[PDB]
């Protein structure tokens, strides 16, 4: 069924297709960036340079990024072109192609149980759920994946509008399985060069105080990579909440060790 918010493409929009035949006059191709509607590419507007081979360019069974040059709205002729394509558009379109595939796979679990004897089943599910998720956040550059990703980490998004059954478990499982494990790249940077002998116990007091105002029972990940370097991967959230945990903790270890003898790295 449709993979996109609108059924028909517009004018000058970047899309994706999959080649199913090669024509004399260009390439007649099916879309997989929308419905399986037909769109015709023309030979002239594929490149601005010569062309020796022809199967080392376009061939069957390839996703190809393209621009919709014209569309007949009533007839359903989607004129197409590969002449204006930049690699930056390919990154943006590959993401939207891949994200729609995963979102429609989530909106396939819904159809496994419900009445789907007719092809239009998924279309019924798509219009009513998809649009209110993505339309509210299309202007900021988000897909319906953002709405679902927000629901798993704070559940009020999918309870603000009609909640389905049995969907919720598989929805949670698939969001939490695929978009994790989930991750902190927090590493402490600490340098010490002691003349102390009481440094061994001094470091222990400093290590356990990586995060202030936490319980004595807080689990953390200590790492020793080299003798002066003390890496502490602090409490694992998303690395946008443990910023204060990373920054101010570094001051503790370097200060605690200077009090017991000599100068150290700051």
């Amino acid at each position: 069924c449709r993979f996109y918010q609108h059924k028909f493409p517009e004018v000058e929009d970047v899309v994706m297709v999959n080649v199913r035949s090669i024509a004399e006059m260009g390439a007649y191709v099916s879309l997989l960036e929308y419905n399986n509607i037909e769109g015709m590419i023309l030979l002239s507007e594929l490149s601005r340079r010569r062309i020796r081979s022809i199967n080392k360019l376009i061939r069957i069974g390839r996703n190809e990024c393209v621009v919709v040059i014209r569309v007949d709205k009533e007839k359903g002729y989607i004129d197409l072109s590969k002449r204006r394509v930049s690699p930056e558009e390919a990154i943006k379109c590959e993401d939207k192609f891949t994200k729609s595939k995963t979102v429609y796979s989530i909106l396939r679990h819904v159809a496994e149980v419900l009445e789907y004897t007719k092809d239009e089943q998924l279309e019924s599910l798509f219009q009513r759920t998809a649009w209110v998720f993505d339309d509210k956040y299309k202007r900021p550059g988000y897909g319906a994946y953002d709405a679902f990703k927000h629901a798993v980490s704070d559940p009020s998004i999918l309870d603000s509008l009609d909640l389905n059954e049995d969907e919720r478990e598989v929805l949670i499982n698939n969001i939490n399985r695929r978009l994790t494990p989930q991750a902190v790249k927090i590493r402490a940077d600490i340098e010490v060069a002691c003349y102390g002998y009481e440094g061994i116990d001094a470091v222990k007091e400093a290590l356990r105080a990586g995060l202030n105002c936490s319980t004595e029972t807080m689990p953390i990940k200590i790492n020793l990579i080299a003798p002066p370097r003390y890496v502490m991967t602090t409490t694992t959230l998303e690395r946008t909440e443990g910023l204060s945990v990373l920054n101010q903790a570094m001051a503790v270890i370097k200060e605690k060790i200077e009090e017991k003898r000599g100068v150290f790295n700051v």
């Binding site: 060069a193 002998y197 290590l207 200590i222 020793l224 003798p227």
Partner: protein
Amino acid sequence: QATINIGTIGHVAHGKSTVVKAISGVHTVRFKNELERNITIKLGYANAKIYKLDDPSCPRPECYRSCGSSTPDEFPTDIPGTKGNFKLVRHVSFVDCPGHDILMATMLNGAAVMDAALLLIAGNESCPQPQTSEHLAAIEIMKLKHILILQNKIDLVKESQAKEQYEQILAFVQGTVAEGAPIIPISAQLKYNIEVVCEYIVKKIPVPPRDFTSEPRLIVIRSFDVNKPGCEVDDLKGGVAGGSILKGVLKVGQEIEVRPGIVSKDSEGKLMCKPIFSKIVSLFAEHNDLQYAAPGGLIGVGTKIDPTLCRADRMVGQVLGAVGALPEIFTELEISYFLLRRLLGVRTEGDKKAAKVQKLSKNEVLMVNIGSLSTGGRVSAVKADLGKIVLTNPVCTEVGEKIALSRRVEKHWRLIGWGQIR
């Protein structure tokens, strides 16, 4: 623990691992392993237990027989006795010094804390070989004469060649003690006559008088690889010094001071140095726990110093005294000295070169090996029997003892003379 330190010094290409494993049973090993471009060029460590079945031969644990594995060309077998437990005679310690000429300053340092030696001669090269003489002379200067020459590589060397070599060495060294030192030819490819070596080292080398009552002094020569394992970091519960003690029974929990010191921040001169103080965590020797560390033995003293001082070999030739030791920490020093009339440690097949070296000139950098310390320093005043030297890093002078003085002849320093501090 240990009772005596026998050193295993010997010039290039005689094989160290075969002989060292036969005497101690503990491999000589160090950084870069790897193995060894030839023979060990690091300061190796090893201890061993010497027992008897009431026989001059020394057993293995399996004391019924011993079948070697030195070569599969033939089977070398020896018989120490038969089994029913063996009586412990003593615990011995070794000091494997560098076998290569460039490493002379290190060989000197390591040597200077031994109580006896084993000159490992190799029959492959020249008969009055440079390094044999170099070693021997240094040994008689430091205060030892408990030497057992060992002909360590005469496996394929014919009996005329090997006979000529022992003769020429013993005839060149006509002014250095060596006539009361035995010369034991051995095999190192079939480990033969090893049993008779065991008889020699208990005969020629008893325990010399050790002063327990006198104040502890530990001379550290080797650092420690502590720490960085797990679990619980960082840096360590600290740092281990491989040192021998030459005076005093160092007891566990005692505080010890490393006396060459660390220099004060923003010094405009050559003074001031401040000793570092560390409490003794543990007194480990062999593989057996101890509460004491008797003198005359090479012991691993774990102390409460932190990883940076032991992360590399940086505690070579440091003097440690318990605690607030009286020994002066000179930065500029008054050497009395004398020179050899030959250049020691160099002499090849053809007169080229080895003769009389010219007199020292002021503002030249020379290695003064004082104690086990190795510092570099420049000569500020040069009279024949009174030179004044200024040293880069301060030297703790335990006693006025001896010194060894070397001059940069070419690529590296070479031994020119000795003397005594005033």
